[PDB]
Design an enzyme around this catalytic site. Structure first.
Site, PDB file in Angstrom:
ATOM      1  N   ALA A 158      -7.133  13.029   2.162  1.00 42.53           N
ATOM      2  CA  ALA A 158      -5.938  13.262   2.939  1.00 42.53           C
ATOM      3  C   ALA A 158      -6.297  13.769   4.339  1.00 42.53           C
ATOM      4  CB  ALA A 158      -5.045  14.319   2.234  1.00 42.53           C
ATOM      5  N   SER A 159      -7.581  13.988   4.606  1.00 43.05           N
ATOM      6  CA  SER A 159      -8.046  14.633   5.852  1.00 43.05           C
ATOM      7  C   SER A 159      -8.010  13.703   7.068  1.00 43.05           C
ATOM      8  CB  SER A 159      -9.439  15.185   5.656  1.00 43.05           C
ATOM      9  OG  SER A 159     -10.347  14.194   5.252  1.00 43.05           O
ATOM     10  N   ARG A 160      -8.001  12.409   6.833  1.00 39.06           N
ATOM     11  CA  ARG A 160      -7.826  11.447   7.930  1.00 39.06           C
ATOM     12  C   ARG A 160      -7.423  10.066   7.434  1.00 39.06           C
ATOM     13  NH1 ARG A 160     -13.577  12.354   6.777  1.00 39.06           N
ATOM     14  NH2 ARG A 160     -13.083  14.360   7.807  1.00 39.06           N
TER      15      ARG A 160
ATOM     16  N   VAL B  97     -14.395  14.212  -4.695  1.00 38.78           N
ATOM     17  CA  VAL B  97     -14.142  13.364  -5.841  1.00 38.78           C
ATOM     18  C   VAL B  97     -15.384  12.829  -6.505  1.00 38.78           C
ATOM     19  CG1 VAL B  97     -11.857  12.669  -4.997  1.00 38.78           C
ATOM     20  CG2 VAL B  97     -13.798  11.138  -4.574  1.00 38.78           C
TER      21      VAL B  97
ATOM     22  N   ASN C 275      -6.985   7.863  -2.938  1.00 41.09           N
ATOM     23  CA  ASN C 275      -7.295   7.131  -1.733  1.00 41.09           C
ATOM     24  C   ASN C 275      -8.700   7.329  -1.167  1.00 41.09           C
ATOM     25  OD1 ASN C 275      -6.438   5.924   1.139  1.00 41.09           O
ATOM     26  ND2 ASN C 275      -7.240   8.089   1.395  1.00 41.09           N
TER      27      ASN C 275
ATOM     28  N   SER D  88      -8.975  -2.198  -1.720  1.00 38.87           N
ATOM     29  CA  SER D  88      -9.274  -2.998  -0.536  1.00 38.87           C
ATOM     30  C   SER D  88      -8.762  -4.411  -0.807  1.00 38.87           C
ATOM     31  CB  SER D  88     -10.804  -3.059  -0.293  1.00 38.87           C
ATOM     32  OG  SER D  88     -11.055  -3.872   0.834  1.00 38.87           O
TER      33      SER D  88
ATOM     34  N   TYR E 263     -20.138  -2.177  -1.609  1.00 37.86           N
ATOM     35  CA  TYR E 263     -18.753  -1.753  -1.429  1.00 37.86           C
ATOM     36  C   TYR E 263     -17.809  -2.561  -2.303  1.00 37.86           C
ATOM     37  CZ  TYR E 263     -14.254  -0.790   0.946  1.00 37.86           C
ATOM     38  OH  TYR E 263     -12.939  -0.422   1.261  1.00 37.86           O
ATOM     39  N   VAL E 264     -17.914  -3.873  -2.161  1.00 32.67           N
ATOM     40  CA  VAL E 264     -17.056  -4.809  -2.870  1.00 32.67           C
ATOM     41  C   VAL E 264     -17.194  -4.636  -4.375  1.00 32.67           C
ATOM     42  CG1 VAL E 264     -16.646  -7.272  -3.339  1.00 32.67           C
ATOM     43  CG2 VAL E 264     -16.969  -6.479  -0.961  1.00 32.67           C
TER      44      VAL E 264
ATOM     45  N   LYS F 214     -15.088  -1.824  -5.440  1.00 30.82           N
ATOM     46  CA  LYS F 214     -13.654  -2.105  -5.308  1.00 30.82           C
ATOM     47  C   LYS F 214     -13.197  -3.073  -6.410  1.00 30.82           C
ATOM     48  CE  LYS F 214     -12.670   0.658  -1.860  1.00 30.82           C
ATOM     49  NZ  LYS F 214     -11.674   1.786  -1.961  1.00 30.82           N
TER      50      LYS F 214
HETATM   51  N1  LIG Z   1     -10.299   1.482   6.919  1.00 30.28           N
HETATM   52  C1  LIG Z   1     -10.685   0.295   6.431  1.00 30.28           C
HETATM   53  O1  LIG Z   1     -11.174  -0.654   7.215  1.00 30.28           O
HETATM   54  C2  LIG Z   1     -10.558   0.064   4.969  1.00 30.28           C
HETATM   55  C3  LIG Z   1     -10.547  -1.234   4.504  1.00 30.28           C
HETATM   56  C4  LIG Z   1     -10.395  -1.452   3.174  1.00 30.28           C
HETATM   57  O2  LIG Z   1     -10.408  -2.735   2.772  1.00 30.28           O
HETATM   58  C5  LIG Z   1     -10.273  -0.377   2.300  1.00 30.28           C
HETATM   59  N2  LIG Z   1     -10.302   0.892   2.797  1.00 30.28           N
HETATM   60  C6  LIG Z   1     -10.155   2.025   1.879  1.00 30.28           C
HETATM   61  O3  LIG Z   1      -9.154   2.901   2.385  1.00 30.28           O
HETATM   62  C7  LIG Z   1      -9.291   4.198   1.743  1.00 30.28           C
HETATM   63  C8  LIG Z   1      -9.217   5.300   2.811  1.00 30.28           C
HETATM   64  O4  LIG Z   1     -10.222   4.988   3.752  1.00 30.28           O
HETATM   65  P1  LIG Z   1      -9.939   5.105   5.330  1.00 30.28           P
HETATM   66  O5  LIG Z   1      -8.736   6.036   5.526  1.00 30.28           O
HETATM   67  O6  LIG Z   1      -9.806   3.778   5.996  1.00 30.28           O
HETATM   68  O7  LIG Z   1     -11.366   5.801   5.727  1.00 30.28           O
HETATM   69  P2  LIG Z   1     -11.701   7.184   6.438  1.00 30.28           P
HETATM   70  O8  LIG Z   1     -11.005   7.380   7.750  1.00 30.28           O
HETATM   71  O9  LIG Z   1     -13.241   7.150   6.413  1.00 30.28           O
HETATM   72  O10 LIG Z   1     -11.131   8.203   5.346  1.00 30.28           O
HETATM   73  C9  LIG Z   1     -11.778   8.339   4.090  1.00 30.28           C
HETATM   74  C10 LIG Z   1     -11.115   9.536   3.474  1.00 30.28           C
HETATM   75  O11 LIG Z   1     -11.739   9.688   2.176  1.00 30.28           O
HETATM   76  C11 LIG Z   1     -12.217  10.995   2.015  1.00 30.28           C
HETATM   77  N3  LIG Z   1     -13.427  11.123   1.156  1.00 30.28           N
HETATM   78  C12 LIG Z   1     -14.600  10.480   1.312  1.00 30.28           C
HETATM   79  N4  LIG Z   1     -15.473  10.937   0.400  1.00 30.28           N
HETATM   80  C13 LIG Z   1     -14.821  11.870  -0.348  1.00 30.28           C
HETATM   81  C14 LIG Z   1     -15.172  12.667  -1.396  1.00 30.28           C
HETATM   82  N5  LIG Z   1     -16.411  12.611  -1.945  1.00 30.28           N
HETATM   83  N6  LIG Z   1     -14.241  13.507  -1.894  1.00 30.28           N
HETATM   84  C15 LIG Z   1     -12.995  13.588  -1.412  1.00 30.28           C
HETATM   85  N7  LIG Z   1     -12.634  12.857  -0.332  1.00 30.28           N
HETATM   86  C16 LIG Z   1     -13.538  12.005   0.186  1.00 30.28           C
HETATM   87  C17 LIG Z   1     -12.458  11.486   3.457  1.00 30.28           C
HETATM   88  O12 LIG Z   1     -12.319  12.923   3.611  1.00 30.28           O
HETATM   89  P3  LIG Z   1     -13.472  14.039   3.719  1.00 30.28           P
HETATM   90  O13 LIG Z   1     -13.729  14.406   2.311  1.00 30.28           O
HETATM   91  O14 LIG Z   1     -12.671  15.104   4.505  1.00 30.28           O
HETATM   92  O15 LIG Z   1     -14.555  13.405   4.529  1.00 30.28           O
HETATM   93  C18 LIG Z   1     -11.346  10.822   4.244  1.00 30.28           C
HETATM   94  O16 LIG Z   1     -10.086  11.568   4.146  1.00 30.28           O
HETATM   95  C19 LIG Z   1     -10.664   4.156   1.065  1.00 30.28           C
HETATM   96  O17 LIG Z   1     -10.551   4.048  -0.372  1.00 30.28           O
HETATM   97  C20 LIG Z   1     -11.360   2.921   1.660  1.00 30.28           C
HETATM   98  O18 LIG Z   1     -12.357   2.232   0.860  1.00 30.28           O
HETATM   99  C21 LIG Z   1     -10.435   1.123   4.113  1.00 30.28           C
END
Ligand SMILES: NC(=O)c1cc(O)c[n+]([C@@H]2O[C@H](COP(=O)(O)OP(=O)(O)OC[C@H]3O[C@@H](n4cnc5c(N)ncnc54)[C@H](OP(=O)(O)O)[C@@H]3O)[C@@H](O)[C@H]2O)c1
Ligand SMILES: NC(=O)c1cc(O)c[n+]([C@@H]2O[C@H](COP(=O)(O)OP(=O)(O)OC[C@H]3O[C@@H](n4cnc5c(N)ncnc54)[C@H](OP(=O)(O)O)[C@@H]3O)[C@@H](O)[C@H]2O)c1
Ligand SMILES: NC(=O)c1cc(O)c[n+]([C@@H]2O[C@H](COP(=O)(O)OP(=O)(O)OC[C@H]3O[C@@H](n4cnc5c(N)ncnc54)[C@H](OP(=O)(O)O)[C@@H]3O)[C@@H](O)[C@H]2O)c1
Ligand SMILES: NC(=O)c1cc(O)c[n+]([C@@H]2O[C@H](COP(=O)(O)OP(=O)(O)OC[C@H]3O[C@@H](n4cnc5c(N)ncnc54)[C@H](OP(=O)(O)O)[C@@H]3O)[C@@H](O)[C@H]2O)c1
Lengths: 234, 234, 234, 234
Positions: D9-11, D60, D86, D137, D150-151, D154
């Protein structure tokens, strides 16, 4: 002694499968529109492979033709063991360019022709625990530009085959999914090199023959194969 | 003249593939954790089929084991022609009852194991235009209750195999998708009758062997096969 | 300021979409065979929502009808922004009991109808960067017993929509895949409760309307939705 | 009054969904590793949208972190109505170049993280007839070069989500399948133009919000959306 019915047996994949199955001693029932071709193949296989061959005009686009064909086949041999619903065709044009006639013909052969073929032999195959093989395409489950009419019918055929399978768990349904094959398909003629992205029908028919040697309890449901010279696309 | 590497060769589908390919005269490189089993299979095939057999401990859950295995295979034979990435396992529980350990183990063998196996031999297969067969499952493209862990790793494996294929168009990748097979899989033992919904490993191995006789330009991409006694589900 | 064409607008999902888009101020062009129904819907929406509404007989099974419909729509409004290719029908029988007539009708509406509809408006949508929504079904990507005819046309429609999209990257194609909906579909009448496994058309239409409020650069490709009372099958 | 839990939820997408749901008056429970970011978002939404916001560190990739997070959330609000699984990440390299660490991290977040998230709130969602949304995705069902690690995760997540759905028909599971989105995903930063092939998170979150306004009996199972500037590939 086993009996294989093959539609689209006058050339290409269907002819190749007839030849391969003849090598294993199957009696054959051949159908296609080109009766001259069927007669020529039949005589050759009867003499060279010592199998019984029956042949008869078949236009899978016509309900009454399929019905009469199946009646004659069943009369000739009794129940069948293998039905190869292979007749098909393809026209390749952007979807707004494809004609009503072209799309209808593809539907009538690739979809409804398969349906007619399978339903006509269905009771027979249920009795024999038989195998219905349908030659669809690798494009039964992917897309290509210019392929919209063709591809749509091959997706439809895939659904049809699987639905026949769900509805008839006593029969084995095999979806055969070749990529490009060097045949007359698509307004072409055999002789195209493997290197330009083509399987040879005899390779496909060999894949088929050898899987058909498996025990009767094995249900091969799906086989997708392409030339190494065809780009691997999904 | 050709060399096949087989992971999970100590029993079940992998052993059966080893036996079938030995009938065709392939030299074999067998890997699994049960070295006792591998040695027993190897001596038999060397004597009874006249083939060269190498075997070595392999735990596909461990990067270093796969790397060592592959190094030793490559040293023994030079380049390989066939790599059968077959090791796998399943734990069947509702997703909320499945343990961390169970899920990780399935990931490490069914997905990362396959990955490690194929990458270790990739340069070799690129040289030989060889064939990498991966035993996924019919559930690499459908769902089952109690299979969420298992199924998810098999869906992952399918995507992996296809991505390897797109990235390496000079290699042939073959996804083998059996239904239920009478092996030790899922905590069981061989001897379960076909009628309960099981293929026998020797049936799967004969489908493989005979498709591996096709010319080198033929790329068999996918084969799905199940017992007639297994309900046809998609 | 925007113009939505809707086929099968006389009842069910299409009518509901017309009503929902009228709430958002779209001008509407409605087509179906029941002109009485279209006129009744049109007068209501013109008065109650303050939108422009055009309606005209449309039989999507007939090339000439679709061409005339599209010509008249385009004349009335200029270019269109949204085309909802929704007309469809289902006959549910085992594949051997399904008639030639039933199968052809499903093909002509569910597949060729969609094709004719999209091609008639394609140049218009290319100009406006517009959106073509096609109501297929959740069964555009799964199987049901008794649905072989219906399902096969919906699989075909999915392939068609995706091929249109690949061939026309300047247009947005949206495949809408509802489960069972309480309409006249399958020989029924509205009034069936949600609890028997049915969505209501107004729920589908609100999902559509609200996704159609997204900016023009957003391409919603697929939406699958079903009642909680429908078993989740894939 | 309804409660939505959002991981990642952080970005990016997760933050956007929090903001959109706050606009509709949901109480929010936010988790991510970046607690400073969560606090900043929470204060803003509490004051500007007048919603209750709870936030807590969540990794997570760690079973115990998910467990503690869920315990704290459930303690704070009682049962939840929406869980948005997410968090995700992507490393993009040819499969032989991808590291053990990179593949493991993707598995731990994209697959096991989802599993942990969903299982932790599962009893709660069953009581509330709630909605679990998982951001997978568009590549949950297609392939890309450099995307193998990655794929694969997913595809695994898609299978996991559908299996949770089969196993828990009293809960609604929604697979959200965005294409490229302008976030920090893939080692990037927001600010990338739509024209280079990117959706904006606020568009996605709006698609979500507005579908979450549907009645509780509607089960939105799948939504795939991409920018018009992303090539439509399947
Ligand atoms: N953006 C695209 O192009 C694209 C294309 C697509 O097909 C699918 N997707 C999918 O969209 C979803 C959100 O990604 P998206 O919003 O685009 O990416 P980003 O800006 O990097 O934010 C990632 C967030 O996840 C968190 N997070 C990470 N690790 C964590 C952990 N261990 N525990 C808990 N949280 C963890 C991280 O927070 P922090 O923990 O504070 O670093 C941040 O809030 C994903 O499932 C993608 O696969 C994207
Ligand atoms: N070759 C490829 O590149 C490629 C790629 C792919 O993905 C799928 N496929 C699929 O492979 C199967 C066999 O095609 P293939 O062997 O390659 O094509 P071709 O050499 O043109 O022989 C066609 C045969 O069908 C018959 N036939 C036609 N209309 C008929 C009718 N109304 N009634 C009855 N039969 C009718 C026709 O006989 P005739 O009636 O005498 O003119 C002839 O025997 C098809 O399902 C394809 O979609 C191919
Ligand atoms: N049988 C079915 O019902 C069914 C249904 C289906 O759809 C797919 N499949 C798939 O078929 C493939 C072969 O399994 P199958 O023959 O039926 O199972 P089983 O008799 O238990 O033999 C397993 C072999 O794997 C090896 N192995 C295990 N861990 C290993 C490790 N870490 N490192 C290295 N090797 C490891 C193990 O050897 P060992 O190491 O000595 O203990 C043994 O040789 C799998 O991918 C299934 O998912 C099956
Ligand atoms: N309801 C479900 O359970 C369910 C489940 C699912 O998965 C998918 N779907 C799909 O939803 C779409 C709308 O159907 P739906 O609203 O549920 O069905 P119904 O109430 O029978 O209204 C049919 C409309 O189509 C029109 N129409 C028919 N023939 C036509 C022709 N030749 N030319 C032009 N229009 C023609 C007909 O109008 P009229 O011509 O005046 O008789 C009427 O307006 C279809 O694609 C389904 O496959 C449904």
């Amino acid at each position: 002694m086993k009996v294989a019915v093959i539609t689209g047996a006058s050339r290409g994949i269907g002819e190749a499968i007839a030849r391969a199955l003849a090598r294993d001693g199957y009696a054959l029932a051949l159908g296609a529109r080109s009766v001259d071709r069927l007669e020529k193949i039949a005589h050759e296989l009867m003499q060279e492979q010592g199998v019984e061959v029956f042949y008869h005009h078949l236009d899978v686009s016509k309900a009454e033709s399929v019905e009469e064909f199946s009646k004659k086949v069943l009369e000739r041999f009794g129940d069948v063991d293998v039905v190869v619903a292979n007749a098909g065709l393809g026209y390749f044009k952007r979807l707004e360019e494809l004609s009503e006639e072209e799309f209808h013909e593809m539907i009538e052969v690739n979809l409804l022709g398969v349906w007619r073929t399978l339903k006509a032999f269905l009771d027979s195959l249920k009795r024999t625990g038989g195998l219905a093989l349908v030659t669809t395409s690798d494009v039964s489950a992917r897309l290509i530009p210019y392929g919209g009419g063709y591809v749509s019918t091959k997706w439809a055929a895939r659904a049809l085959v699987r639905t026949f399978q769900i509805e008839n768990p006593d029969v084995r349904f095999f979806e055969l999914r070749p990529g490009a094959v060097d045949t007359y398909f698509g307004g072409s003629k055999p002789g195209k090199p493997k290197e330009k992205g083509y399987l040879k029908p005899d390779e496909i028919a060999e894949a088929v023959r050898c899987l058909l040697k498996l025990p009767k309890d094995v249900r091969v449901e799906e086989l997708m194969l392409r030339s190494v010279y065809q780009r691997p696309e999904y």
